[PDB]
Design a protein around this ligand. Structure first.
Ligand code: ZN
Ligand code: ZN
Ligand code: ZN
Ligand code: ZN
Ligand code: ZN
Ligand code: ZN
Lengths: 170, 170
């Protein structure tokens, strides 16, 4: 595990850097597909996986990967900071600054993070007792990121998108 | 498209935070499966996808998504900063501070990014004049992120991994 302050900071910044690049590339891949360059889309996804490899290495070298229950606790904390602190403030500044599109994306994010904290809380009870959770499927709204386990409403309660548009993990 | 300095800076931070959360959840997913929690892994992956939705929204609201050629150009500039500036320096700091794991992960990242810039450079050329790239397969080393198109090397020149460990994108 990395312990020297500067090196740790540098690897933290690299982890952030690799995460952003991975994310940029997945967004770019989707755009490339829409423009009819499926092979370039494949190129972006594959390189995104390389960035994931790099980020995972940095993440592990910094000692931030533990067991599933602790990982879930890190999730609960991150989500809670976003719900309670970050997004309410960013949302309010956006509104105060008349930036309507930023008011939208922060509101989309905020409502979904609320759900994530609770799901992770519920899964941690299970993991800590050595039990996997019992779930059939997860629905994600591809517009606002609204998240439902097993059953979802016919329309996204945040953005109004129809259930048929939801992304299903099963 | 967000113009106010504060809101923009906040969205940029939120995009960074969303990218890292997505990355963390993908790392946690892989760990949850290894520990025998396939459903928790499924929950990690699904939520990671929701973070992708939030980051894409912030990214688009920031005006950062263009057409494939200009997306490739932004990729090229990012890769070039990593290759020439960030990782040589982080690698040298890690070595100077005696952090051998960090020396390793920065070396791993470094060697792989050199390949990335060149491929995006090649793909941009094609994409500018309306062509998709020609190329069936991309190969990625799951240990160091080494990248090879069409044909895997007999072993990874960076980490030494057998041809057969490479992840295929086809
Ligand atoms: Zn990288
Ligand atoms: Zn979340
Ligand atoms: Zn929605
Ligand atoms: Zn989010
Ligand atoms: Zn790269
Ligand atoms: Zn390798």
């Amino acid at each position: 595990v990395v312990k020297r302050t500067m090196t740790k900071k540098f690897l933290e910044e690299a982890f952030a850097g690799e995460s952003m690049a991975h994310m940029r590339y997945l967004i770019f891949a989707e755009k490339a597909e829409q423009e009819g360059f499926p092979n370039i889309a494949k190129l972006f996804r594959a390189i995104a996986y390389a960035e994931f490899v790099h980020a995972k290495n940095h993440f592990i070298a910094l000692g931030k990967l533990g067991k599933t229950p602790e990982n879930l606790q890190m999730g609960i904390e991150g989500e809670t900071f976003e719900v309670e602190e970050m997004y309410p403030v960013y949302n309010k500044a956006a509104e105060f600054q008349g930036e309507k599109e930023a008011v939208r994306t922060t509101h989309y994010a905020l409502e979904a993070e609320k759900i994530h904290a609770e799901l992770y809380r519920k899964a941690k009870e299970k993991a800590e007792k050595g039990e996997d959770i019992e779930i059939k499927k997860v629905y994600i709204c591809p517009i606002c990121g609204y998240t439902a386990v097993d059953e979802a409403p016919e329309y996204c309660p945040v953005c109004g998108a129809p259930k048929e548009k939801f992304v299903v993990f099963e």
